[PDB]
Amino acid sequence: PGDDYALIHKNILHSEDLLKYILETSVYPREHEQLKGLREVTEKHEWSWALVAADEGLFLSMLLKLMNAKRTIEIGVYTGYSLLTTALALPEDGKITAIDVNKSYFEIGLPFIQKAGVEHKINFIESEALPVLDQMLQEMKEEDLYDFAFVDADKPNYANYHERLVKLVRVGGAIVYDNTLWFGTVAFPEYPGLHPEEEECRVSFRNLNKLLAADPRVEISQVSIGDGLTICRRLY
Amino acid sequence: DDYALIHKNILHSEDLLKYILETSVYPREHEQLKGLREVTEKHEWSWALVAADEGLFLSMLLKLMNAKRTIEIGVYTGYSLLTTALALPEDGKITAIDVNKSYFEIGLPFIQKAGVEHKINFIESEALPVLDQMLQEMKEEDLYDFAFVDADKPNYANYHERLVKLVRVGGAIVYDNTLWFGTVAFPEYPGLHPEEEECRVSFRNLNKLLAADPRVEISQVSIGDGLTICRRLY
Numbered sequence: 119p120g121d122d123y124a125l126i127h128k129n130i131l132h133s134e135d136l137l138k139y140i141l142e143t144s145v146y147p148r149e150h151e152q153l154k155g156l157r158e159v160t161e162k163h164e165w166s167w168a169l170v171a172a173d174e175g176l177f178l179s180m181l182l183k184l185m186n187a188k189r190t191i192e193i194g195v196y197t198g199y200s201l202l203t204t205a206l207a208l209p210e211d212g213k214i215t216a217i218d219v220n221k222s223y224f225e226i227g228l229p230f231i232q233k234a235g236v237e238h239k240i241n242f243i244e245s246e247a248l249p250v251l252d253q254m255l256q257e258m259k260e261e262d263l264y265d266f267a268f269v270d271a272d273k274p275n276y277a278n279y280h281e282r283l284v285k286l287v288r289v290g291g292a293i294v295y296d297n298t299l300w301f302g303t304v305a306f307p308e309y310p311g312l313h314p315e316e317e318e319c320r321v322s323f324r325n326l327n328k329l330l331a332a333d334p335r336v337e338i339s340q341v342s343i344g345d346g347l348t349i350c351r352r353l354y
Numbered sequence: 355d356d357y358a359l360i361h362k363n364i365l366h367s368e369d370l371l372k373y374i375l376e377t378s379v380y381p382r383e384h385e386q387l388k389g390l391r392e393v394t395e396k397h398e399w400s401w402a403l404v405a406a407d408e409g410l411f412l413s414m415l416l417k418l419m420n421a422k423r424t425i426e427i428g429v430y431t432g433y434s435l436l437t438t439a440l441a442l443p444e445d446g447k448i449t450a451i452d453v454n455k456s457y458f459e460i461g462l463p464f465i466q467k468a469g470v471e472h473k474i475n476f477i478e479s480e481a482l483p484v485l486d487q488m489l490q491e492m493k494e495e496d497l498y499d500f501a502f503v504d505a506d507k508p509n510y511a512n513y514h515e516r517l518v519k520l521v522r523v524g525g526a527i528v529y530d531n532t533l534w535f536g537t538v539a540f541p542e543y544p545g546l547h548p549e550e551e552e553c554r555v556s557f558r559n560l561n562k563l564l565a566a567d568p569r570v571e572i573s574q575v576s577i578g579d580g581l582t583i584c585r586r587l588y
């Protein structure tokens with residue numbers, strides 16, 4: 119027991135005009151027609167602010183092709199914007215493992231994924247990600263390690279996902295954690311006016327960011343795009 | 355000191371940027387990069403220095419694409435160049451171009467102490483004639499994997515025409531300062547230095563050009579002063 123959240127309308131850029139400039143100039147003209155349709159129906163959804171930023175989407179797509187990723191895993195699908203972004207970026211024989219507790223969210227965006235003709239690349243698993251990742255390491259052979267991992271699910275579990283993913287991602291592969299700036303609230307020891315769960319995610323991200331910055335197993339780079347993201351490259 | 359944008363940033367608070375640098379940048383910054391950054395921040399043109407969080411991002415992009423052969427346009431004291439040389443493998447080679455060697459020799463002691471001076475071939479010249487003669491001598495086997503453009507902003511579109519033939523297919527061209535301190539979001543911006551206003555107009559034109567260029571895919575990233583990654587399609 120015991121719209122409720124304060125971090126929906128706050129962004130990390132100085133100006134609403136600047137963010138709208140990037141979207142109107144650099145994103146929307148380059149957005150796939152099915153990504154546009156998926157984003158538009160998601161914007162009407164009850165959890166629409168969890169939708170990944172559209173400029174962050176194009177950045178993830180650029181990362182995937184520049185590193186020639188072929189096998190990826192996504193944790194946190196929602197309506198599937200970043201998933202469809204990933205699928206459109208990979209080669210036609212690319213494969214994605216998509217994990218989410220709620221497949222009903224996934225089926226909101228699946229028609230757009232189907233019309234985009236990339237559903238065949240996606241293996242959706244309806245479950246909590248942690249048992250799926252633990253079952254993977256039992257069956258994970260080094261020849262089939264993932265090239266790329268996008269983490270965008272339950273925020274407080276990121277550090278737990280990290281311990282599994284640096285063994286499920288190949289050496290030199292990338293793990294991308296979304297929301298590592300958490301609307302800017304991570305820059306302060308305390309932040310008043312937060313919903314209890316928004317406060318836990320703030321504390322969890324402040325701990326995760328120090329963890330990733332000290333983890334010798336990876337090289338990192340925190341990027342102030344969207345709600346922030348941290349790119350991790352496995353060293354060993 | 356007569357420029358109106360030196361104290362502007364694109365993030366909403368100085369505290370957020372400071373948090374990123376102290377949490378996720380400085381503990382990962384090479385000792386010679388910190389030394390080069392600290393002596394550059396007292397130079398008279400210190401606001402041209404690339405942001406440290408952006409440098410760590412360029413290094414991540416180089417390693418993820420396994421770049422071997424890159425070119426840098428706009429060296430200054432060599433923070434991005436040293437960042438690039440430290441990211442490339444031992445046999446990596448960089449072509450670094452800058453009209454001013456006086457700036458490069460400030461960072462050269464740090465580059466040598468890092469042990470990566472052998473990767474760098476510095477050319478003191480205007481970049482445009484260097485690129486044009488490269489088009490005359492280049493063989494397809496010698497194409498660059500990665501290009502970082504950070505020099506005179508009004509010439510970015512001219513550099514683009516050369517670079518989409520000098521970087522390999524699937525290679526990356528990254529343009530710095532494409533958000534230009536937030537000024538590009540506005541058709542008119544008051545009180546800018548004449549050179550600052552020239553770059554706002556030039557960047558507003560460059561951003562629409564790149565976004566409509568079928569030769570490349572793009573991603574404009576709101577890091578530092580904004581950068582645009584370009585991936586060559588053909």
Ligand SMILES: Nc1ncnc2c1ncn2[C@@H]1O[C@H](CSCC[C@H](N)C(=O)O)[C@@H](O)[C@H]1O
Pocket residue numbers: 168169170193194195196197198199200201217218219220223245246247248270271272275
């Ligand atoms: N423990 C868990 N395991 C797997 N998924 C979870 C989870 N807890 C929450 N999630 C899911 O993570 C998602 C976060 S929203 C993710 C946004 C999406 N990647 C996009 O591109 O827009 C939600 O759909 C939620 O259902």
Ligand SMILES: Nc1ncnc2c1ncn2[C@@H]1O[C@H](CSCC[C@H](N)C(=O)O)[C@@H](O)[C@H]1O
Pocket residue numbers: 402403404427428429430431432433434435451452453454457479480481482504505506509
């Ligand atoms: N036409 C031109 N051709 C080549 N270099 C030029 C140029 N016009 C200006 N430059 C150089 O481009 C540099 C831009 S400052 C670049 C910053 C640097 N990349 C860093 O990491 O900090 C200046 O040093 C300037 O000397």
Ligand SMILES: O=Cc1ccc(O)c(O)c1
Pocket residue numbers: 167168169170270271296297345
């Ligand atoms: O659940 C709230 C939420 C808000 C923003 C996000 O980016 C996200 O992944 C989740």
Ligand SMILES: [Mg+2]
Pocket residue numbers: 168169170270296297345
């Ligand atoms: Mg997210």
Ligand SMILES: [Mg+2]
Pocket residue numbers: 402403404504530531579
């Ligand atoms: Mg610059």
